[PDB]
Design a protein around this ligand. Structure first.
Ligand SMILES: [Fe+3]
Ligand SMILES: [Fe+3]
Ligand SMILES: [Fe+3]
Ligand SMILES: [Fe+3]
Lengths: 124, 124, 124, 124
């Protein structure tokens, strides 16, 4: 099972667990997901967070919906060598979801050398 | 040339042109891109905005860097038919870029039935 | 845990399970992944396979690597209505991996209305 | 205009140009796209091809359709340093398109340090 490759708890020293925060404004749900809130995770050409995906399983339903996916594609690479571009995309994802349902939000994160990471929160 | 398929000007009645706004906070550049700010573009199972991509060409350089890509993946589809899930991802993209450079920001947008759309702004 | 939303099963009985096949040619590993090999899966504007992702966990290592991702983006939509374009992308993915390692290959599939599906095979 | 950042050229002389080949089998169109067919392109942690996208503009129509997107995500990175994993995804993309239409096929390629590249062929 692929779940055997997904981690949900950080080790001390490096933050990989996606942190999910959301605000409900009417039928609009603004979701912020980020890796390394307190202690930033490295963002270099050889070690960086590649993307964050958000899923939503509505209360009482059987199928999860992928809500969105954000790819962080610049990590300092340039013709002048690794970490020389001065262009870096930080692992902060924002999603605006339109729904009146409640349920579970799941975030999936991938570090290029540290595998898959997950987290979830209850959408009320 | 693929540019022959990309549009940069809306026709009256439907907004496709990605609108780019940004705020510079130190070395952090917070970029917001959205389709249909004033008049929302439809978001249905048969007609919706699929994604928004952001590119950055630094001043005086020769190669553009893709900064990020955001996919809006929920458009009301469910086992109960099109437009029945009550789960929709709005075409609003937020990117946090770390750079001290200046240059040109380009946004690329795709409507599932109306092709590719582009816009650009100067990052100062 | 997100694994609670991922389904698996026999591909000879469940049309959603990604079927993984591979051929090793020197240091090159040609991997073919497909949904609906036995029982074809629908490909319509309202119901279709969105993408297939391939992961590789080398023997004896602790972190899985995402090998590739393929998005199937055309499902008949057009200005003339759903299922009118006559352009459909079939859920068949090919990956050419360069490695001498052995381990486990995992495939992850997403149906727009039937959630996430997984499968895995041993890479010899 | 974004086209000012996209390059094209002869694939027999420029290693970045995506080479498009296809075979029509009934209503099925098997498309193979690859970068570095003539002159291999590097695939290292600091310099590699990130993805290949395929578009199709049917004859006589006004809107291009994105047919598919393939991301090559492994480029040797590991906890042991750049280029140490022995896992590399080669920039070879395959797409199986179902259509009876004719038109133009466009491929878009991105090198992490050499920007965007394009190519096109006529689908008969
Ligand atoms: Fe890490
Ligand atoms: Fe539209
Ligand atoms: Fe299905
Ligand atoms: Fe290059």
């Amino acid at each position: 099972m692929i779940s055997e490759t997904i981690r949900s708890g950080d080790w001390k020293g490096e933050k990989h667990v996606p942190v999910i925060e959301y605000e409900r404004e009417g039928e609009l749900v603004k979701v912020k997901v980020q890796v390394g809130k307190e202690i930033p995770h490295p963002n270099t050409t050889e070690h960086h967070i590649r993307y964050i995906e958000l899923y939503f399983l509505p209360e009482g339903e059987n199928f999860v919906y992928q809500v969105g996916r954000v790819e962080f594609t610049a990590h300092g690479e340039s013709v002048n060598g690794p970490n020389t571009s001065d262009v870096y995309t930080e692992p902060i994802a924002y999603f605006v979801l339109k729904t009146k349902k409640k349920g579970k939000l799941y975030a999936l994160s991938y570090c290029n050398i540290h595998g898959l990471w997950e987290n979830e929160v209850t959408l009320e």
